[PDB]
């Protein structure tokens, strides 16, 4: 088990400072470059820089330079990335990675090891439970569900009939709204026969705000 | 310099897929490729144009020609779906000295679809704002897109006839229990905008075909 272990994901306000780490084992730490890469959710891979653990020689990409500091502590096989002042545009999952020197009569290098990433979400948003609204039976087979509006931060969990009802349920992933708060929907597919006889309630839990809700979904009379 | 990749490539299982990666200095620069499943860390697939690191199957092969490198996957199975990135370097000394400055570059990635089932056209259900949301002075249209394949759609919202891009949010499609995909799109409106249109529409496009629902105030 050669590997890289990074520190936990975190939520930060803008303006704050920050320091994530990346811990090394299974090979000789001082001897291989460490690179840093960022990935915004849903987006591609962005190079931050590389650092040589043995001598702290460092190469930075233009758009990161002077905004972020790489460093290493040799005594604890640990590499660091740090922000003196955080911006919202600093959001993403951060990867540390080992540039390996492969050898032959034509040597070269590739990133063969990757930490698991450190999720860094920068936001002014306050922590809070969602407002929940019924999505009344539509359209057989009819669809009904719950709109879970405006919580922070992720995630929230959604059940149906306290968890008695699991068949025909699809809870969507969440959207970040412009406001910086999330919302999603969970939907249930059913026959029209049951509609108006069977009972449908969504149970929503948002632990960070310790909010819990149950909402009766019903059709129009 | 920058690396240009096709945003997406589609292949039938058992057939061969090529992922291209063009770039101006790639004709004197080794290219490596990385795989990444949604959620997981990238993994090295290939380095120095065509060499496979230990444990990568022969069925994968890299090549280069001129200013374009290529990754080729023969015998494509479903598990190959995901994002593929090429990468190379830059090395130049600054005009005023101070040694070689290195740059690590990545293509923007190619998402690979492997079509393991027949095209299914989406069902579209569009919900108007609930009385409850309206009594809290908000309005959100919800448009749910179900039972489609493959998992790619684009949504357009109309207010009456004209398109609205303001206040729209749309999830990436995810798998359903039945193994077809589903997505959702949201339009945020004032109770004033809602009450004041003849109607709103969510139009979904899947493989060139459209399906749309329309709703109106109660």
């Amino acid at each position: 088990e050669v590997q890289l272990v990074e520190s936990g994901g975190e939520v930060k306000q803008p303006g704050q400072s920050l320091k994530i780490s990346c811990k090394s084992s299974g090979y000789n730490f001082l001897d291989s470059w460490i690179g840093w890469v960022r990935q915004i959710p849903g987006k591609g891979l962005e190079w931050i820089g590389i650092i040589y653990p043995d001598d702290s020689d460092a190469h930075y990409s233009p758009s990161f330079e002077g905004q972020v500091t790489m460093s290493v502590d040799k005594s604890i096989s640990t590499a660091y990335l740090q922000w003196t002042t955080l911006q919202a545009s600093d959001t993403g999952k951060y990867f540390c990675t080992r540039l390996y020197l492969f050898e032959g009569a034509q040597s070269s290098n590739a990133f063969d090891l990757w930490g698991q990433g450190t999720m860094i979400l920068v936001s002014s948003g306050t922590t809070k439970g969602p407002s929940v609204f019924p999505l009344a039976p539509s359209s057989g087979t009819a669809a009904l569900g719950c709109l879970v509006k405006d919580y922070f931060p992720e995630p929230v969990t959604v059940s149906w009939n306290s968890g008695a009802l699991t068949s025909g349920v699809h809870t969507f992933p969440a959207v970040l709204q412009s406001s910086g708060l999330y919302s999603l929907s969970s939907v249930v597919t059913v026959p029209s026969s049951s509609l108006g006889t069977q009972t449908y309630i969504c149970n929503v839990n948002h632990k960070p705000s310790n909010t819990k809700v149950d909402k009766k979904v019903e059709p129009k009379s | 310099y920058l690396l240009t990749q096709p945003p997406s490539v589609s292949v039938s299982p058992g057939q061969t897929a090529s992922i291209s990666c063009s770039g101006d200095k790639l004709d004197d620069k080794y290219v490596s490729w990385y795989y990444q499943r949604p959620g997981q860390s990238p993994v090295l697939l290939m380095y120095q144009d065509f060499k496979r690191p230990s444990g990568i199957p022969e069925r994968l092969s890299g090549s280069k020609s001129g200013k374009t490198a290529t990754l080729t996957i023969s015998g494509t199975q479903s598990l190959d779906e995901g994002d593929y990135y090429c990468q190379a370097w830059d090395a130049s000394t600054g005009v005023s000295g101070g040694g070689t400055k290195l740059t690590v570059l990545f293509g923007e990635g190619t998402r690979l679809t492997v079509l393991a089932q027949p095209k299914a056209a989406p069902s579209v259900t569009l919900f108007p704002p609930s009385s409850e949301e309206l009594q809290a002075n908000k309005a959100t249209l919800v448009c749910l897109i179900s039972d489609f394949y493959p998992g790619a759609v684009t949504v357009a919202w109309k207010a009456d006839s004209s398109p609205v891009k303001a206040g729209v949010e749309t999830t990436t499609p995810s798998k359903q229990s039945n193994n077809k995909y589903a997505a959702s799109s949201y339009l945020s409106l004032t109770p004033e905008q809602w009450k004041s249109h003849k109607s709103y529409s969510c139009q979904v496009t899947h493989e060139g075909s459209t399906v749309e629902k329309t709703v109106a105030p109660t």
């Binding site: 020689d57 020197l101 034509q106 040597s107 | 620069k29 370097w89």
Partner: peptide, 13 residues
Amino acid sequence: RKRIRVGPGQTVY
């Protein structure tokens, strides 16, 4: 060991 070899005939370090 610091060797980074960027392409044919190009070595830094």
